[PDB]
């Protein structure tokens, strides 16, 4: 019976809330009160990448920390040599409405997707000496929001149809599907071991999934609006989420509750991208107010501001070695900070 | 060794210039409408599991790209953000005096959306033929859904098309005013709304979009070239 099921769900929610409350003894702020502050950090633009004719959405750093891919609404995917600003490949897309891209860990394949509901896998190395579509992963019922490579043969993609799928590139058919969300999935991050991933779906909640069992392990709540950016902590035990309510939050899987909230009264705009430094001390968040802020992950204090961009910041990414951070924006410019 | 990288980068730049020209000379439009709106026929009028459709047509040597959202979810607040660089947004509303209030709400949301505060909206009042027969039938109880109609009179300077009865003119001008009040409610003037009356099968639709885009580009040029 519907009412009985709803009552049981409410009672179990109360039980879970009681477990959360009994599991908390002190806040991260109280424990870290003795940790010395990170202090003010000053970062200068080292590269300004030009050659895009439309607002940029997503960029991914390569495993070598040198090559990065970018996606713009003009229909071009450009692979930039960040060391010299040179362009290595320019891929004319079949659909100009791209919103996400991913660079394979081996670097042999690059993927993208958007409003077409199709993920296009582009092969960068071939005897023909040209870039061609290796496979198109059609089958989604909504716009693709995020794409990440688990392996050269497997890619996990998020869509606005409240569903996430693990695709097989060789056969082009879904291997597993995740359907526990109730809203548009915006971004997902892969754990360092690729054994787990988390995503936010415009329902003010973040959920943890298993790529083999195909089921949600944990559900995280506490946000007041749509979650736009999600990123794992470098150690893989915690993750940070950014939402439209102008606040970032840190969640730990083992504690299964919010640890810290990064809020400032001067911010009344949402967060577009969230990323962690290699050590995890610095939390970098992109904002709709034309600049990015760096937060002390432990002290929750604002350590610095990056205001080079003249438009909305769309994508933020940190190199695997943590040498530099590249911030994209709707001004059709990518700026690398160090 | 490294010189080949610069050579291929310059080749890429040269390839990018000759499609940058196309991108600059191209005009992009978004076709928004309800399920009952005759936007499907409007697309058919234009002539030279996918989530988005594209239509190619040109009037007076200028190329227009019109995008229609196909297999998509009704969570507009997220994917609508992409169409903030389109020259104009074509909004089609069905005269069903009541799905019209939902159309008003959608238009209001589009107008007040933060990232759509700079795009002119080309408003098409589609299916005027159905409205004419409905109002002439006497069962068009517009007053029940919109009480302001019982205390509204046609503007003195209104120009009615020949052969249209006063009742049809009053009803359709009230429908225009319902959108114009929302459009002017902002009072900022960054973007303009162009209300038009059109039918599902009409050849003048291409000219209307051409003129609206010309006006929008002229208004943009006034600001770009230090005139205002």
């Amino acid at each position, epitope marked *: 019976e519907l009412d009985q099921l*709803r009552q049981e769900a409410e009672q179990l*929610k109360n039980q879970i809330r009681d477990a959360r409350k009994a599991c908390a003894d002190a806040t991260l702020s109280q424990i870290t009160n003795n940790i010395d502050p990170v202090g003010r950090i000053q970062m200068r633009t080292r590269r300004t990448l030009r050659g895009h004719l439309a607002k940029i959405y997503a960029m991914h750093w390569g495993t070598d920390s040198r090559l990065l891919v970018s996606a713009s609404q003009d229909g071009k995917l450009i692979i930039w040599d960040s060391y010299t600003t040179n362009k290595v490949h320019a891929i004319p897309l079949r659909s100009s409405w791209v919103m996400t891209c991913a660079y394979a860990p081996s670097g042999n394949y690059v993927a993208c997707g958007g409003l077409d509901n199709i993920c296009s896998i582009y092969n960068l190395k071939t005897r023909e000496g040209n870039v061609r579509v290796s496979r198109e992963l059609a089958g989604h019922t909504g716009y693709l929001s995020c794409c990440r490579f688990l392996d050269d043969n497997q890619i996990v993609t998020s869509s606005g149809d*409240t569903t996430c799928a693990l695709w097989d590139i060789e056969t082009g058919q879904q291997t597993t599907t995740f359907t526990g969300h*109730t*809203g548009d999935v915006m971004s997902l991050s892969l754990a360092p071991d690729t054994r787990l991933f988390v995503s936010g779906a*415009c*329902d*003010a*909640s973040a959920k943890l999934w298993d790529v083999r069992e195909g089921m949600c392990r944990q559900t995280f*709540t*506490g*946000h*007041e*609006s*749509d979650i736009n950016a999600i990123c794992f902590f470098p150690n893989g035990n915690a993750f940070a989420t950014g939402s*439209d*309510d*102008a606040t970032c939050r840190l969640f730990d899987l083992r504690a299964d509750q919010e640890l810290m909230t990064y809020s400032h009264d001067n911010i*009344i705009c*949402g967060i577009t991208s969230v990323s962690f430094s290699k050590s995890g001390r610095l939390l970098l968040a992109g904002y709709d107010d034309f600049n990015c802020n760096v937060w002390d992950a432990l002290k929750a204090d604002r350590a610095g501001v990056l205001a080079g961009h003249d438009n909305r910041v769309s994508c933020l990414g940190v190199t695997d070695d943590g040498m530099a951070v590249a911030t994209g924006s709707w001004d059709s410019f990518l700026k690398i900070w160090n | 060794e490294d010189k080949a990288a610069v050579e291929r980068s310059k080749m890429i730049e040269k390839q990018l210039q000759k499609d940058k020209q196309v991108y600059r000379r191209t005009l992009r439009l978004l076709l928004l409408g309800a399920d009952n709106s005759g936007k499907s026929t409007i697309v058919k009028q234009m002539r030279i599991t996918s989530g988005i459709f594209e239509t190619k047509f040109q009037v007076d040597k200028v190329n227009f790209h019109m995008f229609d959202v196909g297999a998509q*979810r*009704d*969570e*507009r*607040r997220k994917w609508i953000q992409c169409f903030n660089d389109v020259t104009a947004i074509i909004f089609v509303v069905d005269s069903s005096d*009541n799905r019209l*209030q*939902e159309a008003l*709400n959608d238009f*209001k*949301s*589009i*107008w*007040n*959306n*933060r990232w759509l505060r700079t795009i002119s909206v080309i408003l098409f009042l589609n299916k005027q033929d159905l409205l004419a027969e409905k109002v002439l039938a006497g069962k068009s109880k517009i007053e*029940d*859904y*919109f*009480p*302001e109609f019982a205390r509204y009179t046609t503007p003195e300077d209104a120009t009615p098309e020949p052969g249209e009865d006063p009742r049809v003119t009053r009803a359709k001008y009230f429908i225009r005013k319902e959108f114009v009040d929302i459009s002017t409610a902002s009072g900022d003037g960054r973007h303009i709304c162009y209300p038009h009356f059109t039918c599902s099968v009409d050849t003048e639709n291409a000219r209307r979009i051409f003129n609206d885009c010309k006006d929008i580009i002229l208004q943009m040029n006034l600001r770009e070239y230090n005139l205002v």
Partner: nanobody
């Protein structure tokens, strides 16, 4: 967690009055624009009224203009909808909806496909 618990409803004779109240929790109520939505039997969701953060801007749908009044109490995170002169056509389940983001003017809460930021609603029946 963000939740909206509506209260009131029931059966009211035509021409009577009925007050609907919703308790808001899990978010900062004083920064989000609120809305009312109803779904009549065999009909899609219909927007009713809106109220800004401070209440200085209010709008109503034509069918209820002059009959329904919307008020909010930021001091106790409660939203009110005082209904008068009920009619048989008003029978429907009423939902309380919130804007997706704070400090925003436009809204897209009429979506039927599982809008996260609305409650389960309270049934209202107008009959003899």
């Amino acid at each position: 967690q963000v939740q909206l618990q509506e209260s009131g409803g029931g059966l009211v004779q035509p021409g009577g009055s009925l007050r609907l109240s919703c308790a808001a929790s899990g978010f900062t109520f004083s920064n989000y624009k609120m809305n009312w939505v109803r779904q009549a039997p065999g009909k899609g969701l219909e927007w009713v009224s809106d109220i800004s953060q401070s209440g200085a801007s209010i709008s109503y749908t034509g069918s209820v203009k002059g009959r329904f009044t919307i008020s909010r109490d930021n001091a106790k995170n409660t939203l009110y909808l005082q209904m008068n002169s009920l009619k048989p056509e008003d029978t429907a389940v009423y939902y309380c909806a919130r804007c997706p983001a704070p400090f925003t003017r436009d809204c897209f809460d009429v979506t039927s496909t599982t809008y996260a930021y609305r409650g389960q609603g309270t049934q209202v029946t107008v009959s003899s």
